[PDB]
């Protein structure tokens, strides 16, 4: 067709589109926005990974209402009879059929675009009304169903294990604490809600580093909820250690936390494993030499193992996660840095010949990190909810009403009092726990 009444015709060129290198299906490196739509709706072939990647990452170079407009421009093919008959069986048909595949993928895996913009949804139902022709009058049956479904805001596969109880009796929420709940059931329950926190994170909340700017609270709410959860347990662990002023009760608390870690590492809950490692690394907890001096050497190895994960830019951690088999709760913080660095170390508009192209190679990399986050979000955990305990950990507010300085400072002053510097000698402190301090152990049945 004409190069003017249909803009998706301008021929390819080294100022319109660049492909990657290395074998028979092209991969886009950069491209103007028009070219990028054209390849998103190509007559010759469909590209599912392009479609997937594009709908995940376009909002940083083209606003969602622009996209809809392009997708319609792409659909209004004009007419130039024998080799114009091919111009219907081989061209307009595939294109138009590949616009509607976009619209279906769009309105079905990224519906948040239409939650946040009624007019965008309006135009789409308008546009899919204009769709006629019994070839697609069946794609439009599929998209409009999807639309309506989306407007309507346990089944364990195997048998869960039996729910371990230790001192605290079922139904007695008032006795629930670190040392009286069963260590196995603590790690189970934390891991349970920690996984559910992890699974809630939608890629709308990561792409664009949007959790690091003014509207993080509007846009990245379940990620923040997930980060704030693990911040609180780390602080709780710390408050439990240094607020146990007695040396013997403290070695009992540190011991019980390392044991939780143990079940954590058994469940492949790397988030909860790192909650504990961070606790043990804080400047209050790390300095208590007397308290670690009495840890069973088998336990010191268990913690040494976990801390070494973190060492060397998380090398051992990264290894282990790629080997273990789900269910699994990964540590989110690494994908956070990888997504920022990637978005900030690759240019937004690779320029060539004097015109800007949209760096889609940079977008593809961000999409890959997002994709990887999802592969760990699908397999759930074969463990039973103890709603009484879940409520206990849900409510942990170790910081009280204190700001973070006041509290961090307090936690350090407390470690200072209970194990003083070299000159002044170690005072002895009352017991506060009235129950016995022996670990029920970390084996079931």
């Amino acid at each position, epitope marked *: 067709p004409s190069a003017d009444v249909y803009r998706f015709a301008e021929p390819d060129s080294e100022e319109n589109i660049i492909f990657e290198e290395n074998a028979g299906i092209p991969i886009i490196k950069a491209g103007t926005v028009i070219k990028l739509i054209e390849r998103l709706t190509y007559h010759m072939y469909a590209d599912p990974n392009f479609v997937r990647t594009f709908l995940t990452t376009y909002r940083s170079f083209c606003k969602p209402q622009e996209l809809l407009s392009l997708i319609i421009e792409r659909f209004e093919i004009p007419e130039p009879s024998a080799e114009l008959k091919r111009f219907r069986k081989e061209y307009i048909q595939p294109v138009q059929l590949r616009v509607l595949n976009v619209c279906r993928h769009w309105v079905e895996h990224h519906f948040y675009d239409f939650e946040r913009d009624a007019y965008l949804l309006q135009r789409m139902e308008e546009f899919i009304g204009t769709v006629r022709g019994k070839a697609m009058k069946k794609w439009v049956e599929s998209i409009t169903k999807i639309i309506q479904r989306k407007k309507i805001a346990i089944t364990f596969q195997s048998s869960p294990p039996t729910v371990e109880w230790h001192i605290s009796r079922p139904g007695h929420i008032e006795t629930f604490d670190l040392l009286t709940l069963h260590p196995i059931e603590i790690a189970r329950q934390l891991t349970l809600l920690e996984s559910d926190l992890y699974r809630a994170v939608q890629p709308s909340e990561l792409v664009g580093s949007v959790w690091t700017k003014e509207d993080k609270e509007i846009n990245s709410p379940n990620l923040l909820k997930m980060i704030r959860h693990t911040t609180n347990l780390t602080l709780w662990f710390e408050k439990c250690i240094v607020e146990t002023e007695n040396l013997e009760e403290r070695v009992a608390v540190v011991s019980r936390i390392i044991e939780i870690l143990q079940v954590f590492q058994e469940l492949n809950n790397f988030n909860g494993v790192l909650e504990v490692v961070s606790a043990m690394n804080s400047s209050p907890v790390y300095r208590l030499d007397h308290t670690f001096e009495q840890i069973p050497s088998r336990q010191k190895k268990i913690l040494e193992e976990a801390h070494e994960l973190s060492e060397d830019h998380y090398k051992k951690y990264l290894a282990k996660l790629r080997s273990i088999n789900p269910p699994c709760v990964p540590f989110f913080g690494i994908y956070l840095t990888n997504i920022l660095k990637t978005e900030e170390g690759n240019p937004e508009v690779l320029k060539r010949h004097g015109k800007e192209l949209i760096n889609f190679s940079k977008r593809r990399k961000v999409a890959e990190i997002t994709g990887e986050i999802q592969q760990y979000q699908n397999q759930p955990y074969c463990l039973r909810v103890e709603s009484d305990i879940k409520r206990f950990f849900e409510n942990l507010n170790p910081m009280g009403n204190s700001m973070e*300085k006041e509290f961090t400072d*307090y936690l*350090f*002053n407390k470690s*200072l*009092e209970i194990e*003083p510097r070299n000159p002044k000698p170690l*005072p002895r402190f009352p017991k506060k726990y009235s129950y016995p301090l022996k670990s029920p152990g970390v084996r079931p049945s």
Partner: nanobody, 108 residues
């Protein structure tokens, strides 16, 4: 900055009062060292809430601070022989500022 003390010697069932001159998010207390025995915590005020006492001394001792006058007191009442110890003043702000510790020996 320094920490000070004021007390002395007195007989059983007495009412000895102790002082400290400190010369914000902090915590301060008292410790005593009975001779031949390990240093012992007696009491503290985390300004956050209230004060805690050692088990030995539950209802006989009481802590306080006149923020107006940079001072900290341990009130010792219903004294006994067993509390014969040097009694240290101690304020943890970002450093452990301790005190030399006046002597307190009680006879019957």
């Amino acid at each position: 900055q320094l920490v000070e003390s004021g007390g002395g010697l007195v007989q059983a069932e007495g009412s000895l009062r102790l002082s400290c001159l400190v010369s914000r998010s902090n915590l301060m207390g008292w410790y005593r060292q009975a001779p031949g025995k390990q240093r012992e915590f007696v009491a503290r005020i985390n300004p956050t809430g209230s004060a805690n006492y050692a088990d030995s001394v539950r209802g006989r001792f009481t802590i306080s601070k006149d923020n107006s006058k940079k001072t900290l007191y341990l009130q010792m009442g219903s004294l006994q022989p067993e509390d014969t110890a040097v009694y240290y003043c101690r304020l943890i702000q970002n450093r452990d500022y301790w005190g030399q510790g006046t002597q307190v020996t009680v006879s019957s």
